Amino acid sequence: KPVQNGSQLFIKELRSRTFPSAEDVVARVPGSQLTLGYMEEHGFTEPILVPKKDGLGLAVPAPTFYVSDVENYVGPERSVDVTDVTKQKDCKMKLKEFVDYYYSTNRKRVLNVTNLEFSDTRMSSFVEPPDIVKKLSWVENYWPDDALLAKPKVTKYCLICVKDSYTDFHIDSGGASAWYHVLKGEKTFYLIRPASANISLYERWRSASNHSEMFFADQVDKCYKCIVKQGQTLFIPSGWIYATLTPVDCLAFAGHFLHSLSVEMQMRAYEVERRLKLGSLTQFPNFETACWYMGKHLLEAFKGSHKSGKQLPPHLVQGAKILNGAFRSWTKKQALAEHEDELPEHFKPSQLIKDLAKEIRLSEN
Numbered sequence: 001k002p003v004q005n006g007s008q009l010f011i012k013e014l015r016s017r018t019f020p021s022a023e024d025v026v027a028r029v030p031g032s033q034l035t036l037g038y039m040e041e042h043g044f045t046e047p048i049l050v051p052k053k054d055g056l057g058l059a060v061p062a063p064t065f066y067v068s069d070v071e072n073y074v075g076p077e078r079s080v081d082v083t084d085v086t087k088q089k090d091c092k093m094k095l096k097e098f099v100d101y102y103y104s105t106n107r108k109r110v111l112n113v114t115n116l117e118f119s120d121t122r123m124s125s126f127v128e129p130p131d132i133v134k135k136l137s138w139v140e141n142y143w144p145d146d147a148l149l150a151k152p153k154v155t156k157y158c159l160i161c162v163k164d165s166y167t168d169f170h171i172d173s174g175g176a177s178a179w180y181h182v183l184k185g186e187k188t189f190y191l192i193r194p195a196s197a198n199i200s201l202y203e204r205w206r207s208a209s210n211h212s213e214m215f216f217a218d219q220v221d222k223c224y225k226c227i228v229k230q231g232q233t234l235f236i237p238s239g240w241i242y243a244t245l246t247p248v249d250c251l252a253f254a255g256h257f258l259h260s261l262s263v264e265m266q267m268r269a270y271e272v273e274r275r276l277k278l279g280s281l282t283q284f285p286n287f288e289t290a291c292w293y294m295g296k297h298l299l300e301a302f303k304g305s306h307k308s309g310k311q312l313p314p315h316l317v318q319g320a321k322i323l324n325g326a327f328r329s330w331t332k333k334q335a336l337a338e339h340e341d342e343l344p345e346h347f348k349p350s351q352l353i354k355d356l357a358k359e360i361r362l363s364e365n
């Protein structure tokens with residue numbers, strides 16, 4: 001008999017499986033050591049676990065900040081996406097209704113809130129992303145504060161999961177990288193490397209009518225188990241395919257960001273998303289716009305490289321080429337209609353592409 005992902009049975013089985021430890025792949029790093037230098041030296045190609053907040057410049061509430069508080073600072077009448085884990089189906093309800101379910105006994109259902117972005121609430125002031133995320137983030141660095149398009153609202157999520165909840169394998173929208181901090185409880189991540197065949201396997205699995213009856217990790221070479229405990233912060237690189245299990249009631253904060261070390265993976269994940277035609281529910285809003293602003297940054301970085309005769313690092317040049325190809329793809333007569341909606345004001349894509357192409361040729365000398 002086919003077992004639904006997320007079902008009691010499925011979790012009992014999952015808890016019994018053995019996985020390779022993330023000892024192999026996930027670096028343990030002191031907060032004050034997670035610098036742009038470390039990132040640039042290692043390339044952010046593997047998840048990073050920071051055991052203690054110290055040095056991250058991460059601001060989060062004391063661990064004595066409960067779901068009941070979330071209800072207060074966010075708003076009990078706030079509409080929120082609740083995931084029914086057993087049905088692996090979603091629905092909407094007032095926060096107050098979820099929080100009421102959360103505190104009941106005996107809980108019949110297994111429900112999660114994993115899409116609750118609170119940067120537009122009073123609770124926003126209680127959480128500040130780590131310094132390294134602010135340094136890496138495209139939006140943070142290159143999106144003008146007076147822009148007419150709203151910044152992507154993906155920087156502050158509150159995740160509330162009950163014991164025995166399960167989030168199925170996925171790549172985060174836009175191939176965005178993530179910071180994920182467990183305030184209370186713990187979270188188990190099953191991490192899959194975004195090797196080319198793994199990505200291809202994921203796309204095929206994710207679009208099969210029966211994907212919620214198939215355990216994706218059975219299809220890959222290695223699925224690493226990483227347990228993130230209370231107070232620890234996990235950073236997930238671009239493109240990683242992953243799932244989570246919640247062994248005890250968990251409260252966590254997370255944020256998503258794009259950056260210059262994974263321009264290719266970001267575009268490839270985006271392209272995968274495009275084809276899957278999934279719900280905009282989790283999509284990375286104005287992903288294209290972020291890329292546009294990055295493209296203008298690169299142009300300026302190139303022009304600035306001429307005043308000093310100093311080259312731009314190879315990853316930026318390659319990045320520029322990938323972005324430029326995207327820009328061209330997005331501004332094709334036919335395509336302009338769909339993608340113009342994310343074009344920043346006062347942008348002339350033609351001159352941008354031309355100027356970038358030219359400036360890439362020059363660096364290719």
Ligand SMILES: O=C(O)CNC(=O)C(=O)O
Pocket residue numbers: 114157159161167172178180187244245252254
């Ligand atoms: O909290 C969970 O278990 C699931 N969270 C995510 O997959 C995420 O924040 O992108």
Ligand SMILES: [Cl-]
Pocket residue numbers: 137138139140256257258259290
């Ligand atoms: Cl970003």
Ligand code: NI
Pocket residue numbers: 170171172
């Ligand atoms: Ni996710």
